[PDB]
Amino acid sequence: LMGGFGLKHPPPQILIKNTPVPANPSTTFSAAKFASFITQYSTGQVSVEIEWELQKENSKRWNPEIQYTSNYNKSVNVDFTVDTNGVYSEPRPIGTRYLTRNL
Amino acid sequence: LMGGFGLKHPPPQILIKNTPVPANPSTTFSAAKFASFITQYSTGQVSVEIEWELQKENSKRWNPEIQYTSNYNKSVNVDFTVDTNGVYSEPRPIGTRYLTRNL
Amino acid sequence: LMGGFGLKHPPPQILIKNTPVPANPSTTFSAAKFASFITQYSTGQVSVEIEWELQKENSKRWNPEIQYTSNYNKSVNVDFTVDTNGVYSEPRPIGTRYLTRNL
């Protein structure tokens, strides 16, 4: 209902966790499990690549279509670009339906 | 200066004419050339086909371009279409420069 | 909903037109398009042939079916036939459901 491609076998979930590292266990033995660990985090790059297939547009309509066009009027901030403080902002939602096929 | 492709050898001119047909020459001989012909014209289809080569657009610009878009507001006559009397009309001149390359 | 076979690729439309023939263009040149043509029409035969596939009736019902039967009573005009003035007329609509299969 939200949108997109209903799949029976979606791209599988990728779960990730830091392996816990204990911290300074006492010398004498105790059965209770460790309540204290090294405080640590991890970081690194992630690369996702998807190959899309397209349906080429083949039509005979005479007059020109509607297209998605960023307006040419001068403004303080360009759309879809960083501002002066570095905060990237999307100005408006972009639907996918512009080209016109006859019903 | 007007625009387009300066060529040293342009597509050659194609000239066409109806061959004149005399009309009822008098029996006795006269040297003066014929002043009177059958009144006739000719008609038929003409087919011109040109093969254009393109330069594909390869850019990395992040934000969206400007495109040529027919406005979606309701109007008496659609643009680039016949009117109710059958007269085809071009609403406005369309320049070719929209896509943006860095200088 | 009306009836028949929903198709995704129907038999394609066949469009036909008389090529317009101009009539007596004036000698001096004028850019405006021709407003006057020869008045002409065309005619000829058209042949459509369709190959239908059937599902043969295989049943074991003991007693006789219902069939579509033109009544044998005498009448002024036979059904599905021309009248005395030559006007072909279909007397009644003929549905396709007569043979009986068990549900």
Determine the Cα–Cα distance for residues B78 and B84; give it in Å rounded to an integer: 11
Q: Which amino acid is at C23?
A: A
Q: Do the beta carbons of residue A97 and residue B97 sit within 8 Å?
A: no
Contact B43 C24 (CB under 8 A): no
- Chain B residues with beta carbon closer than 8 angstroms to that of C29: none
Query: If we measure between CA atoms, which residue out of B14, B91, B87, B84 comes closest to residue C34?
Result: B87
Interface partners of C (3+ CB pairs, < 8 Å)?
B
Q: Do the beta carbons of residue C66 and residue C31 sit within 8 Å?
A: no
Query: If we measure between CA atoms, which residue out of C42, C22, C45, C47 comes closest to residue C32?
Result: C22
Method by which this entry was solved: cryo-EM
Q: Do the beta carbons of residue B67 and residue A68 sit within 8 Å?
A: yes
Helix%, strand%, coil% for chain C, nearest 5: 0, 5, 95
CA distances from residue A36 to A16, A18, A20, A24, B87 in whole angstroms, order as listed: 21, 15, 10, 9, 85
b or e along A33-62 (b: 16 or more beta carbons within 10 Å of the residue's beta carbon)?
eeeeeeeeeeeeeeeeeeeeeeeeeeeeee
**Tokens encoding B75:** 């109007």
Contact A68 B64 (CB under 8 A): yes
Strands (E), C1-103: none
Contact B63 A79 (CB under 8 A): yes
**Tokens encoding B61:** 């610009």
CA distances from residue B87 to B46, B76, B83 in whole angstroms, order as listed: 22, 14, 6
